Amino acid sequence: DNEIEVIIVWEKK
Amino acid sequence: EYIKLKVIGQDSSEIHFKVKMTTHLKKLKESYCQRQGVPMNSLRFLFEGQRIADNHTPKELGMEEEDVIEVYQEQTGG
């Protein structure tokens, strides 16, 4: 959030 | 701010990634390795065909949104 931030969320078909 | 990085593996394992253009790709590599159970080395990531630096960042790749990244199981000759 402050320093580094990476959001990973996939979705299956 | 956030770009869409399509990390497609080699076994139908796909995952959607949201990374900031200010953060390095080293943290992106860490996120995929922990969510997949595979040593940082074991794999290899590519873009525009050419390999990806460990310190790289769209700051250098100018990766727009919807971009794509390929991951290949690491190997060597015999």
UniProtKB/Swiss-Prot annotation, chain B:
Keywords in alphabetical order: Acetylation, Cell membrane, Chromosomal rearrangement, Cytoplasm, Host-virus interaction, Isopeptide bond, Membrane, Nucleus, Phosphoprotein, Ubl conjugation, Ubl conjugation pathway
Quote the subcellular location field of this record.
Nucleus membrane; Nucleus speckle; Cytoplasm; Nucleus, PML body
- Predominant location of this chain? nucleus
User: Where in the sequence is Phosphoserine found?
Assistant: S13
What are the protein's GO molecular function terms?
Answer: enzyme binding; potassium channel regulator activity; protein tag activity; RNA binding; small protein activating enzyme binding; transcription factor binding; transporter activator activity; ubiquitin protein ligase binding
Q: How does it get modified post-translation?
A: Cleavage of precursor form by SENP1 or SENP2 is necessary for function.
Q: Where is this cross-link: Glycyl lysine isopeptide (Gly-Lys) (interchain with K-? in acceptor proteins)?
A: G78
Q: Where is this cross-link: Glycyl lysine isopeptide (Lys-Gly) (interchain with G-Cter in SUMO1)?
A: K6
Q: Where is this region: (Microbial infection) Interaction with Tula hantavirus?
A: 1-6, 18-21
Residues the UniProt record annotates as site (Interaction with PIAS2)? F17
One CC-aspect GO term: nuclear stress granule
Q: Where is the Ubiquitin-like domain?
A: 1-78
- Summary of subunit composition and partner proteins: Covalently attached to KCNB1; UBE2I increases cross-linking with KCNB1 and PIAS1 decreases cross-links with KCNB1. Interacts with SAE2, RANBP2, PIAS1 and PIAS2. Interacts with PRKN. Covalently attached to a number of proteins such as IKFZ1, PML, RANGAP1, HIPK2, SP100, p53, p73-alpha, MDM2, JUN, DNMT3B and TDG. Also interacts with HIF1A, HIPK2, HIPK3, CHD3, EXOSC9, RAD51 and RAD52. Interacts with USP25 (via ts SIM domain); the interaction weakly sumoylates USP25. Interacts with SIMC1, CASP8AP2, RNF111 and SOBP (via SIM domains). Interacts with BHLHE40/DEC1. Interacts with RWDD3.
Q: Which family does it belong to?
A: Belongs to the ubiquitin family. SUMO subfamily.
Q: What is this protein called?
A: Small ubiquitin-related modifier 1
- What is the scientific name of the source organism? Homo sapiens
What is the covered span of the full protein? 20 to 97 of 101
